[PDB]
């Protein structure tokens, strides 16, 4: 899993908005530096900037 290091406000209809400290699971990372993620915290799914999160156990 990953943890958000910053808040992120969606900038596209495909993005996932999140707050710092949310825990996310990566659904797919095969397209580039924007990863498809699912928030374990909020249940929402969408693309995130991969440099805004850090790995977690």
């Amino acid at each position: 899993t990953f943890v958000a290091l910053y808040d992120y406000e969606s900038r596209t209809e495909d993005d996932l908005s999140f707050k710092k400290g949310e825990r996310l699971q990566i659904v797919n990372n095969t397209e580039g530096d924007w990863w498809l993620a699912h928030s374990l915290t909020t249940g929402r799914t969408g693309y995130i900037p991969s440099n805004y999160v850090a790995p977690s156990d």
Partner: peptide
């Protein structure tokens, strides 16, 4: 906050 990455390429 860091700059955002470029959007994904197909």
């Amino acid at each position: 906050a860091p700059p955002l990455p470029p959007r994904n390429r197909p």
